[PDB]
Ligand binder design. Structure first.
Ligand SMILES: Cc1nn(-c2cccc3cc(Cc4cccc(C(F)(F)F)c4)sc23)c(CO)c1C(=O)NCCO
Ligand SMILES: Cc1cc2nc3c(=O)[nH]c(=O)nc-3n(C[C@H](O)[C@H](O)[C@H](O)COP(=O)(O)O)c2cc1C
Ligand SMILES: CCCCCCCC/C=C\CCCCCCCC(=O)OC[C@H](O)CO
Ligand SMILES: CCCCCCCC/C=C\CCCCCCCC(=O)OC[C@H](O)CO
Ligand SMILES: CCCCCCCC/C=C\CCCCCCCC(=O)OC[C@H](O)CO
Ligand SMILES: CCCCCCCC/C=C\CCCCCCCC(=O)OC[C@H](O)CO
Ligand SMILES: CCCCCCCC/C=C\CCCCCCCC(=O)OC[C@H](O)CO
Ligand SMILES: CCCCCCCC/C=C\CCCCCCCC(=O)OC[C@H](O)CO
Ligand SMILES: CCCCCCCC/C=C\CCCCCCCC(=O)OC[C@H](O)CO
Ligand SMILES: CCCCCCCC/C=C\CCCCCCCC(=O)OC[C@H](O)CO
Ligand SMILES: CCCCCCCC/C=C\CCCCCCCC(=O)OC[C@H](O)CO
Ligand SMILES: CCCCCCCC/C=C\CCCCCCCC(=O)OC[C@H](O)CO
Ligand SMILES: CCCCCCCC/C=C\CCCCCCCC(=O)OC[C@H](O)CO
Length: 441
C-alpha cells in the first residue's frame, strides 16, 4: 500500500497520497489561458457583431466552446489534486475525466474537417453554397460531431483499455490502467485517420483551384475627393493592383448609384476624405453612397477602406471609421485595417504602396487563417498521437514524454482562439471597440 513512483518532469514522487506539484501547476496555468482565450472569442463574436462567414462561424464557435470546456474540465481535478488526494484509487474519476477530454478534442478535430469542406464548397460552387449550406444543416452537422465523439470513446467504460493519457494525473490511471493496441487501432481508424484525411485531401484540392487565368480578381475602387488627395491615393492604389494583374474599375463617388454597386466584385476598396467645419462629415459626393450602403451588395463582400485627413481634427479620418462601422454592421468582411493618410498623400506614397501590396493577400486571407489554425492544431497533437501509437504497441514507455506530449496537445485549445482573434481585422476591430467600452468600466 502507498508505493511511490517518480514524477514525469524528474523531481518528486507520486503515490495514492503524494501529488506531483510542479506538473499540476503547469496544467493549471495552461487552463487559465485556454479559458481566457476562448471566453474572449465567444464574447467578441456575439457582442461585437461578427457577421461575415456566418456559416463557417458555426464551427469556429463550437470549437471555442469545446476548448473552453477542455480548460475547465482540466482545471477542476488539478485544483482538487493541489488541495488534497483521497488516499484511494480514483478508478472511475480518471476514467470519466479521460473520456470527457477525448470527446472534446474529437469535437474540435471534426470541426476543422468540416471547415475545410465548407471552404471547398464556397470556392468551387459559391452560388450553390449560398442556397444549400443552411443553419438547419449546420446544426445537424454539429449534433452528429458531438454524438459520434461520445460513441467512439464509449468502449473505455466496457473493458477495451485506456483511450489516452489525459487521466494519468490520477495515480490509478497512470499505473494500473493500460492502453490496448486494438482500442488505439479503433480510435485511429474512427477518428485520427479519417479527420486528418478529410483536411489533407480537401486543402490539397483548395490549393490547386484556379477559376480566373486572365486576371487575379476584379476590384472596384470608389472614392470621394474634394481637393484631389483621396483621388491621388485611389489612383496610386489602382495602379499597384493593375500591375499585379487585377481588373481594376476606379470610379468617382459623384458618378455612381448605390443599387447593386458592389455586385460582381471580389474586392471593393472605399476611399473617402473627412470634411465638416464643426462635425465629422463625409466628403460630399460620398454621403449619398453611405446613406444607401445597405443597397450596394455589401453582405459577405470583401472590403477595405482608405482616406485622407489631418490629425489636428478629433475625428482623424473619421469618414473611414464611419464607413468601416456601417460595412461591419451590414456583414461585410473587413479584409484589412483601413489606410488613414495624415497630410499630403504624395509624401506618404510608400505607406499607400505598402497597403496596396497587403490588400493583394485580402481575397485568400480568411481561407489562409483557417488553414493555419488547422495546421497548428495537428502539429501540436502529432507528438501525442505518435506517443499513443508507440506506447499502445509497447515500443516505448516514457512518462516524461507522456506528460509533455499530452500538455502540448491540450495547448491547441489556446492556439485556435489566439490565431483566429489576431488574424481577423473585423475581429480585432470588434475586440478593440468592445474593449474600449470595457476599459472605462
Ligand atoms: C500531476 C501528475 N501527473 N502525473 C503523471 C505522471 C506520469 C505521466 C503523466 C502523463 C500525464 C498526462 C497529462 C499531462 C498534462 C495535462 C494533462 C491533463 F489532461 F490533465 F490536463 C494530462 S499526467 C502524468 C501524475 C501521476 O498520476 C500526477 C500526480 O500528481 N499523481 C498523484 C495524484 O493522482
Ligand atoms: C473644412 C474642412 C474640414 C475638415 N475636417 C476634417 C476632419 O474632421 N478630420 C480629418 O481627419 N480631416 C479633416 N480635414 C482635412 C481633409 O480631410 C484633408 O485635407 C484631405 O486631404 C482632403 O482630401 P480630399 O482632397 O480627397 O477631399 C478637413 C479639411 C477641411 C478643409
Ligand atoms: C522542468 C523545470 C523544472 C523541473 C520541476 C521542478 C521540481 C519541483 C518539484 C515539485 C514536484 O514535482 O512535486 C512536489 C511533490 O511534493 C511531490 O511529491
Ligand atoms: C507552441 C504552443 C504552446 C502553447 C502556448 C502556451 C504558453 C505557455 C505559457 C505558460 C504555461 C506554463 C509554463 C510553465 C513554466 C513556469 C513554471 C512555474 O512557474 O512553476 C513554479 C511552481 O511554483 C513550482 O512549484
Ligand atoms: C460507432 C461505434 C460505437 C461503438 C461503441 C461500443 C460500445 C461499448 C462496447 O461495444 O463494448 C462491449 C464489448 O464488446 C464487451 O463488453
Ligand atoms: C457512459 C457510461 C456507460 C456505463 C456502462 C458501464 O459502466 O458498464 C460497465 C460494464 O461492467 C462493462 O461491461
Ligand atoms: C487515411 C490515413 C490518413 C493519414 C493522413 C492523411 C494523408 C492522406 C492524404 O494526404 O491524401 C491526399 C489525397 O490522396 C490527394 O493527393
Ligand atoms: C513514427 C511515425 C511518424 C509519422 C509521421 C507523420 C507524417 C504525417 C503524414 O502522414 O503526412 C501527410 C501530409 O501531411 C499530407 O499533406
Ligand atoms: C495556384 C497558384 C498559387 C496562388 C495562391 C493560392 C493560395 C491559396 C488558396 C486559394 C484561395 C483562393 C481565394 C478564394 C476566395 C473566395 O473567393 O472565397 C470566399 C471565401 O472567403 C474564401 O474561402
Ligand atoms: C494516423 C493518423 C495520424 C494523424 C496525423 C496527421 C497530421 C497531418 O497530416 O496534418 C493535417 C493537415 O495536413 C494540416 O494542413
Ligand atoms: C513542439 C513541437 C510542436 C510543433 C509546433 C509547430 C507550429 C506550426 O505548425 O507552425 C507552422 C505554421 O505556422 C502553420 O502552417
Ligand atoms: C514521441 C514524440 C515524438 C515526436 C517528436 C517530433 C515532433 C513532431 C511535431 C512537429 C514536427 C513538425 C515541425 C515543423 C512544422 C512544419 C511542418 C508544416 O507545417 O508543413 C506544411 C507547410 O505549411 C507547407 O507545406
Ligand atoms: C514534446 C516532444 C518534443 C518535440 C520536438 C522538440 C522541439 C524543440 C523545442 C523546444 C524544446 C522543448 C522541450 C523538449 C522536450 C524534451 C523531450 C524529452 O524530455 O525526452 C527526452 C528525455 O531527455 C528522455 O526522456
Amino acid at each position: 500500500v502507498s508505493e511511490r513512483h517518480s514524477c514525469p518532469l524528474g523531481f518528486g514522487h507520486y503515490s495514492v497520497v503524494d501529488v506531483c506539484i510542479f506538473e499540476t501547476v503547469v496544467i493549471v496555468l495552461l487552463t487559465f489561458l485556454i479559458i481566457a482565450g476562448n471566453l474572449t472569442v465567444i464574447f467578441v463574436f456575439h457582442c461585437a457583431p461578427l457577421l461575415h462567414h456566418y456559416t463557417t462561424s458555426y464551427f469556429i464557435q463550437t470549437m471555442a466552446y469545446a476548448d473552453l470546456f477542455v480548460g475547465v474540465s482540466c482545471l477542476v481535478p488539478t485544483l482538487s489534486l493541489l488541495h488534497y488526494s483521497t488516499g484511494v484509487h480514483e478508478s472511475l474519476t480518471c476514467q470519466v475525466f479521460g473520456y470527457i477530454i477525448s470527446v472534446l478534442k474529437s469535437v474540435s478535430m471534426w470541426c476543422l474537417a468540416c471547415i475545410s469542406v465548407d471552404r471547398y464548397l464556397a470556392i468551387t460552387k459559391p452560388l450553390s453554397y449560398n442556397q444549400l449550406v443552411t443553419p438547419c444543416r449546420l446544426r445537424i452537422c454539429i449534433i452528429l460531431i458531438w454524438i459520434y465523439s461520445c460513441l467512439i470513446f464509449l468502449p473505455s467504460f466496457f473493458g477495451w483499455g485506456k483511450p489516452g493519457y489525459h487521466g494519468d494525473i490520477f495515480e490509478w490511471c497512470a499505473t494500473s490502467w493500460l492502453t490496448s493496441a486494438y482500442f488505439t487501432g479503433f480510435i485511429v481508424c474512427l477518428l485520427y485517420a479519417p479527420a486528418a484525411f478529410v483536411v489533407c485531401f480537401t486543402y490539397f484540392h483548395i490549393f490547386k483551384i484556379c477559376r480566373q487565368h486572365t486576371k487575379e480578381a476584379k476590384a472596384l475602387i470608389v472614392y470621394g475627393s474634394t481637393t484631389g488627395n483621396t483621388e491621388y491615393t485611389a489612383e496610386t492604389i489602382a495602379r499597384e493592383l493593375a500591375d499585379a494583374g487585377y481588373e481594376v474599375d476606379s470610379r468617382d463617388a459623384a458618378s455612381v448609384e448605390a443599387g447593386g454597386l458592389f455586385e460582381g466584385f471580389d474586392l471593393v476598396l472605399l476611399g473617402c476624405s473627412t470634411w465638416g467645419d464643426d462635425s465629422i462629415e463625409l466628403q460630399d459626393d460620398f454621403i449619398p453612397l453611405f446613406d444607401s450602403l445597405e443597397e450596394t451588395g455589401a453582405q459577405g463582400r470583401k472590403v477595405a477602406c482608405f482616406g485622407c485627413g489631418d490629425s489636428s481634427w478629433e475625428y482623424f479620418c473619421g469618414a473611414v471609421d464611419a464607413i468601416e462601422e456601417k460595412l461591419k454592421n451590414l456583414g461585410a468582411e473587413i479584409v484589412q485595417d483601413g489606410l488613414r493618410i495624415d497630410g499630403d498623400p504624395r509624401a506618404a506614397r510608400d505607406d499607400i504602396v505598402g497597403w496596396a501590396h497587403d490588400v493583394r493577400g485580402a481575397i485568400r486571407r480568411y481561407l489562409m487563417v483557417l488553414f493555419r489554425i488547422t495546421s497548428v492544431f495537428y502539429m501540436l497533437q502529432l507528438p501525442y498521437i505518435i506517443y499513443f501509437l508507440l506506447e499502445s504497441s509497447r515500443v516505448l514507455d516514457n512518462p516524461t514524454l507522456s506528460f509533455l506530449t499530452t500538455w502540448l496537445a491540450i495547448s491547441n485549445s489556446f492556439c485556435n482562439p489566439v490565431i483566429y482573434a489576431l488574424s481577423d481585422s473585423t475581429f480585432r476591430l470588434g475586440l478593440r471597440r468592445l474593449s474600449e467600452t470595457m476599459c472605462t468600466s
